[PDB]
Design a protein around this nucleic acid. Sequence first.
RNA 1: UAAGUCGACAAGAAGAUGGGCUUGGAAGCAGCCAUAAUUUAAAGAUCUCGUAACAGAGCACUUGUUAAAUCUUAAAAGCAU
Lengths: 124, 201, 98, 147, 245, 46
Amino acid sequence: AISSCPAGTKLNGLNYFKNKADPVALPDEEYPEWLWRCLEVQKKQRRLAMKRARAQEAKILASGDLEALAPKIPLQKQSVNLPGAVNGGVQDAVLADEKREELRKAMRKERKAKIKESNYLKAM
Amino acid sequence: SKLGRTPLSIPPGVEITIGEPFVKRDMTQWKQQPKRKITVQGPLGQLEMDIPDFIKIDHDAEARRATLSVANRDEKEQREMWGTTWAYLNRFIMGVSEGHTAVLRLVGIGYRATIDTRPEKEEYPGQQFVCLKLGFSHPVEMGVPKGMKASTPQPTRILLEGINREQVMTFAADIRRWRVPEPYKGKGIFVNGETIKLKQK
Amino acid sequence: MLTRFITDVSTRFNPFSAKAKAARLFLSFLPPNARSNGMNITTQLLPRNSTETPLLYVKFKDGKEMNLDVENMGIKSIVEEVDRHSRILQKQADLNDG
Amino acid sequence: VEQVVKLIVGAGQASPSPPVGPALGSKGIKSMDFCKEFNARTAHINTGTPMPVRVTVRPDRSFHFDVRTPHTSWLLLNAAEAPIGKGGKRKGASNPGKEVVGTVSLKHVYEIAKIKQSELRLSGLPLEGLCRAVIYQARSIGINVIP
Amino acid sequence: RLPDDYVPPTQPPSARPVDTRKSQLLRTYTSMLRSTPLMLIFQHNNLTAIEWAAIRRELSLALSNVPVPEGAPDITSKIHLQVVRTRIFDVALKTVEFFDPSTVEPTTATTATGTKVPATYNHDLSKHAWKAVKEATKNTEAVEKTVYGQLAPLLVGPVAILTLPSVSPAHLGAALSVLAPSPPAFPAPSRKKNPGYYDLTCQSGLQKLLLVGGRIEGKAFDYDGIKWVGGIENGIEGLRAQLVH
Amino acid sequence: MKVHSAIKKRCEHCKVVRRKANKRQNGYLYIICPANPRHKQRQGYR
RNA sequence: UAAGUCGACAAGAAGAUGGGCUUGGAAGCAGCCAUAAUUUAAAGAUCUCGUAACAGAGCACUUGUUAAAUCUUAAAAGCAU
Ligand SMILES: [Mg+2]
Ligand SMILES: [Mg+2]
Ligand SMILES: [Mg+2]
Ligand SMILES: [Zn+2]
């Protein structure tokens, strides 16, 4: 009941073969779980926020400590050793091999801005 | 220099003979700087040059090698001649053993070349004269300098040979000076793979 | 390095041998399409326990067959000898073509 | 060098024509032979369906072409139920940033990816990472993605 | 405000710049040499993009036909054929072998508040690691006796490394026949079942990959030795046979 | 050739060299370019 | 900056995909809008060429070889051209 398309829905224009019928939506449970999570990447008036937004953040923030206000260095500049241990186990191994992939994206995103800006500085 | 440090592999047959610091008195100069006469003899011939004294040659006869070094790397004059003296020895070693060659290509309808002897204008007995038809009213004839062997496998192809690279490439430029490659039809004399970019029309 | 004039190359060496380092580098310099063009290449890997002297075989398209020891000469030195012979063929090709 | 050419042709419509004729007729290969050889490749698809082809022309004018699945954009619009415009083909948003043509659900994305995984050259890529590649293209054609 | 002596907690003093990819990649291999018990070292020769994709397409397919019905972790996707930086990967072995993280003395550290807190620098990118590996490498002969010395000649030129999270002989036969087939021990897949394997692109890529050597549990292994490990059906079964005796 | 008082490189192949300098004259600064001959420039007057 | 700086050389520089619109045609590269992804040693819905439009050649970027033990790059200042 979480998906808009119910079971039995006719998927229009998804069959280009002659001897076959257009796909029919199957039950929601039968579909893999990642399909309900792969969509996690989709992202006067100023005066009103100034009255409330500016003030509320200062109160909750509790600017009395310098721990939650640090620069918060990104993952592409730290030097802490990655969570890799010898003979730690498959769980440790997989869990250790998963951060090497989360760091890969970090360097990738940096190349985009570094290349987009290098091409922007040549087409002034 | 990163080239002066590289040892010079002396192939079999080549012999390097280092002289001694000498000074040829010059009445026009109050103090001449000592030099060293370096001879490089081998199968094809013998070449000689005079290097400054501050350059030191560690001629290793055992391993057949010779590394160069200067007395002071901080002086601009010594850094330059260090690499230039190395580049010359490299050519000398690889010129007396193997030899240097230059290829000239004659592009253009009516361009020919022959190697004949002109006893009238011979500077030395048996001088070979390259005769070139390049569209001029007169015939263009040039005598090969003493020490070069010029031949034409084909009418539109010259082949120069010699042990002195500077002499070979200099004589190929004199022949090319008559017809420099043009960018509209590619006509001219191209030396050692030289090419010219053509125009649209 | 010019590989166009190289017909086939047969290299036999042991990986764990520090001397075979130069042999491995020579294999990488070859371009990707060397197999499609028709060049034959056979690579033999010797056991780690006992290592036979490394062997390098080269042959140009004019019949010349080159054989250079891997231990005495380094990768840089080997590239010079193969370049000289492959270079003269370029001049000869241009000389006799046209 | 074996040059390659890109041409979009109909399902069973292979004959000398603007899409087919000039694309390969000039190079030298026998267009008629290729035209009659393409029909055998596409004999189970609806007539007129667009089919990308990468024809490789080896030296000696011996051609070999690999038929490819329909364009992802053509499938997204075909499955988005977009209004037909100029040329009789479903057109996409002129300004994907503001305009919106259709609302394709994720269940349609899960199928558009399965039909694109049939290709051997694309059969290795994981399906989890392939459904987000088309979702990344729906933002460029003005189609909204619905959970 | 943050004081001058304060240093970020997730950015201790490094031996060399951390922003550069040279060092950021060193932190990866060092942890990969610890989390990967079984590792095969290949040599790639100017493989093209399409060829690489095809080669990695057979592994996924061949590795997806391994029976694992024991409810074990889904070890079928963390196996990757990764091209590595041989120069920076050769330093990883040094830092992983000739460096004892337990030989560092903790020192006070200043936080945003300025309070001194004791901290120890054991990260691989530390100046202490750089100093140890250098001094340890001074002895040439003693290094050859170490595992690094038995794998230093292998890290020459371009090398591609295959990483397996666990020592599964079954996964080896699925990956050892697609990259270095040698029948009848590890025969290549059949054409009547795996036609993609014998493709123009794939077949032309597998000829440029050579299995030079392998590393298992921090032990150098020769190509012939890898067959023995791959020959075993399973590790747990091999131990049972000894118990019967 | 264009004789300017402010010579600048107009591509990656342009090179700055001081030529014609000898025992009798100081020479000039040139912008030599083998790719495009229109990038040729000189600084100074005879 | 020996974790190989700098330069050169060898190769790579992918895929969904000719992004959508525009146009006789617009396929990275007339113009307009978008430019969260993905997989990779890396690869901009594209920085300079090139085509009528494709193709093609380079660049950013990636690995390897060579190779520096005071020797990389930029800025400012002084005196000169
Ligand atoms: Mg001048
Ligand atoms: Mg466009
Ligand atoms: Mg255009
Ligand atoms: Zn220029």
